[PDB]
Amino acid sequence: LGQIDYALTAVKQGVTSLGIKATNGVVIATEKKSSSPLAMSETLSKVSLLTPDIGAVYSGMGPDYRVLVDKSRKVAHTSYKRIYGEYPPTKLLVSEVAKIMQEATQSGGVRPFGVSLLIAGHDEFNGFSLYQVDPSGSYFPWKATAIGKGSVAAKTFLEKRWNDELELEDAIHIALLTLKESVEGEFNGDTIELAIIGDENPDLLGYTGIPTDKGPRFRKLTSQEINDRLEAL
C-alpha cells in the first residue's frame, strides 16, 4: 500500500455525492456538511462550474478540491481556449485534470490529492458525458456512479435503477432518492447541492444581439427549486 491507497481511503471517508447521465442531460448532486449552525452554508459551494457546459463535484478533502477547481478553470483557458476560440470538450478537460493529478502524484515532495471528482459535461459531436477522476490520475466514463461514504448502497441502487430510456427529470428524481437514503444529517434544500448539464439557457447569457451565441448548459438549482422537488418525493 502507498500514498494513492491512503488518498483513496480519505476519499472513502468523505461525503457521498453522485452522478447520473440520462439521454438529454447529466445530473450531479451532493450533501453539504456543516455541524455548526453559526456557520453559513451559502458561503461554501461543493459544485463548481468549470466551463459554461462542464461542471464538477467532489468527494474528499475540501481545500484540495478548491485548489483543483481554480487550476482546472485556468487550464481550460490556457490550453484549449485562446487557440481555437471555444471551450474544450469534456474529454480533453478531464484529461487535463487527470494530468494535473498525475503530476501531483509523481512529483517528489508532494502528496497526492485526496479527492475523487465526478465531472459532467456536454459537447458537440459527443453529446452528454460523465466521468470519474481518481486521486491516482486515471479517469473512467460512467453512466451512473457514486463515491464517498455510502457509495456501495448508492451504486447498488443506481444499478437497480439506471436504464437506457432515462430522462433528465427521472435522473433528478433518482438522485434525490439516493441522497435521501444516505443523508447524514438533515435533508432539506439548504443541505443539498444539485446541478444539471442540459439545454442551453439564453436567460443566463447576460446579453442579446448575437444569434449564434447560446447560453450555458450548466445550471445550479436554488434552494427553493430543491425544496419544491423534495415536496414531490
Binding site: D64, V67, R111
Partner: protein, 240 residues
C-alpha cells in the same frame, strides 16, 4: 515519516495539521466575533501578567487594510507572519484590480496558502486561526474564519480558544431565540456591550479595561478601541 511530515497515514490522516490545531491553543486567550446590522465586533482576552511588559505593544488584533481587520488565535510569530502576508496580498489586489479586496477573497487566498503548506512536505503549517472581519461593499458585515487545514467559511458569529465551546453554545441558544442572523442594534457601541456581556456570561468572570481588546468594523473603516473606550463601555454596561 507520517508523524513528522505532511503525508497521508495508513488511515488517511495528516498528523502534522492536527498538531497545528493543538498549537493554536498555546495561549489562553478566547476571542468572540459577532456582526450587527451595519458593523462587526471582535473582542479578545488580553493577559499581561508580567509587570515589566508594555501593555500597548501586546495585541492579537491586526489592521490588514482600511476596512478589513483580523484576530489571530495562536502564537504571535505565526500571527505576525500571516498578518504581513495578508497586508501584502491586500495591497497587491488593490494595485492590480483597482478596487478594495473583499474579506472573503482574502480569506480564500490565505486558505489556499494554508493548503499549499499542508500539501508540500518541506513547509510546515502555521498554528493560527486568522478570523477576518469587515463590512463588505456588496455583502455587508462579514466574518470569515480559516484554519491550518486550509478550510475557511463565513459565520454569523464565532468563538475561538480553549473555552470556545461554552461561548458557541450560548451564541447558538441566543440565535435560536432571536431567529435572525445578526444582532439588532443600530449603534456599534450596543453591539460591543452585547459581546462583552456574552463573554462575561460564558467565561463566568469580570473584566477590567486592561483585560480586553476590542475591534469594530464599520462601512467607513475598521478600528481598534482604546483602553479608555473599553472603560467607558464597561461603565455603560455596569449602569444597567
Amino acid at each position: 515519516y507520517d508523524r513528522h511530515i505532511t503525508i497521508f497515514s495508513p488511515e488517511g490522516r495528516l498528523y502534522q495539521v492536527e498538531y497545528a490545531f493543538k498549537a493554536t491553543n498555546q495561549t489562553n486567550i478566547n476571542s468572540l466575533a459577532v456582526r450587527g446590522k451595519d458593523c462587526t465586533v471582535v473582542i479578545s482576552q488580553k493577559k499581561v501578567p508580567d509587570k515589566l511588559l508594555d501593555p500597548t505593544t501586546v495585541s492579537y488584533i491586526f489592521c490588514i487594510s482600511r476596512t478589513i481587520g483580523m484576530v489571530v488565535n495562536g502564537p504571535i510569530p505565526d500571527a505576525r507572519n500571516a498578518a504581513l502576508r495578508a497586508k501584502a496580498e491586500a495591497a497587491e489586489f488593490r494595485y492590480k484590480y483597482g478596487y478594495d479586496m473583499p474579506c472573503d477573497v482574502l480569506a480564500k487566498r490565505m486558505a489556499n496558502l494554508s493548503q499549499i503548506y499542508t500539501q508540500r512536505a518541506y513547509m510546515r503549517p502555521l498554528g493560527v486561526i486568522l478570523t477576518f472581519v469587515s463590512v463588505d461593499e456588496e455583502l455587508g458585515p462579514s466574518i470569515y474564519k480559516t484554519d491550518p487545514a486550509g478550510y475557511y467559511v463565513g459565520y454569523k458569529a464565532t468563538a475561538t480558544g480553549p473555552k470556545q465551546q461554552e461561548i458557541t453554545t450560548n451564541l447558538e441558544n441566543h440565535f435560536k431565540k432571536s431567529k435572525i442572523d445578526h444582532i439588532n442594534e443600530e449603534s456599534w457601541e450596543k453591539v460591543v456591550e452585547f459581546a462583552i456581556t456574552h463573554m462575561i456570561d460564558a467565561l463566568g468572570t469580570e473584566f477590567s479595561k486592561n483585560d480586553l481588546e476590542v475591534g469594530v468594523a464599520t462601512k467607513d473603516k475598521f478600528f481598534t478601541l482604546s483602553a479608555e473606550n473599553i472603560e467607558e463601555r464597561l461603565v455603560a454596561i455596569a449602569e444597567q
